[PDB]
Amino acid sequence: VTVDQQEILNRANEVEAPMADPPTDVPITPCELTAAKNAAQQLVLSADNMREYLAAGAKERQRLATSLRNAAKAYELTDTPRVATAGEPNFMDLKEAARKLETGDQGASLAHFADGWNTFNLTLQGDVKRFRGFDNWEGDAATACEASLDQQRQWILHMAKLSAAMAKQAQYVAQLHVWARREHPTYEDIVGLERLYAENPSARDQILPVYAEYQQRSEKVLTEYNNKAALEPVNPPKP
């Protein structure tokens, strides 16, 4: 049962000092498709809960610092909800699908989101020295505090890992959207083809198979998008 009261107090300050700020970028849907919107809703929830749990972690480190100081004198959190996602694609017609896909920021906010959460991952996990054991504080109280610090340390690294996973979900949805724009017939081309059909009556039997292929392309894209955009909630552990 050795003590150094100076160390206890210094470590109290070190432990509750501000950690990296989590980003507050709001990820917006890349386009007007339901599957895109539901992805954004899921990210909003996951990221709100991450920030709420990170605020609870700051409380925990304050509470450790208070506990360290009260020693030296002597000498509501829930799961991230899952957003409902459509079981079946729902094939709207060509033009409306193309309009929905082409209306919105096309993934720009998702890149910014990912970038913020990625930086927070990388930086937060290099601020764990604050949870090391003591040099000259020994006994049961010291051992208890060391356990508690090590629990916070492990929780921080887990939070950093979940931050990386969430940023990747956002990148994944941005990639998906880019893929969907590359593959889906453009609004302008659908209108062009409808125009070609209207204006060329004798060509209409040659145009019909082309239009049917535009429809198969669209459906194929909407089926992928509906399926691949459904995200898992990010569910952090309690500190």
Give which of Na ion, Cl ion, none residue 34 binds (C-beta under 5 to 8 Å, depending on kind): Cl ion
Regarding 96 and contact with Na ion (CB under 5 A), the answer is no
Question: Minimum Å distance from CB 120 to Cl ion?
Answer: 32
With respect to Cl ion, which residue has the nearer C-beta, 55 or 178? Answer: 178
In the complex, the smallest distance separating the C-beta of residue 78 from Cl ion, rounded to whole angstroms, is 29
For residue 218, state whether it binds Cl ion (rule: CB under 5 A). no
When binding is defined by CB under 5 A, the residue of 8, 31, 33, 54 that contacts Cl ion is: 33
**Measured from the CB atom, is 160 or 229 closer to Cl ion?**
229
110, interface contact from Na ion, Cl ion, none, CB < 5-8 Å by kind: none
- Among Cl ion, Na ion, none, the one that 224 touches (CB under a kind-dependent 5 to 8 A) is none
Q: Give the chain as a 3 state SS string.
A: CCCCHHHHHHHHHHHHCCCCCCCCCCCCCCCCCHHHHHHHHHHHHHHHHHHHHHHHHHHHHHHHHHHHHHHHHHCCCCCCCCCCCCCCCCCCCHHHHHHHHHCCCCCHHHHHHHHHHHHHHHHHCCCCHHHCCCCCCCCHHHHHHHHHHHHHHHHHHHHHHHHHHHHHHHHHHHHHHHHHHHHCCCHHHHHHHHHHHHHCHHHHHHHHHHHHHHHHHHHHHHHHHHHHCCCCCCCCCCC
Is 34 a residue that touches Cl ion (CB under 5 A)? yes
Question: Residue with CB nearest Cl ion?
Answer: 34
183 binds Na ion per the rule CB under 5 A: yes
Binding site for Cl ion (CB under 5 A): 33-34
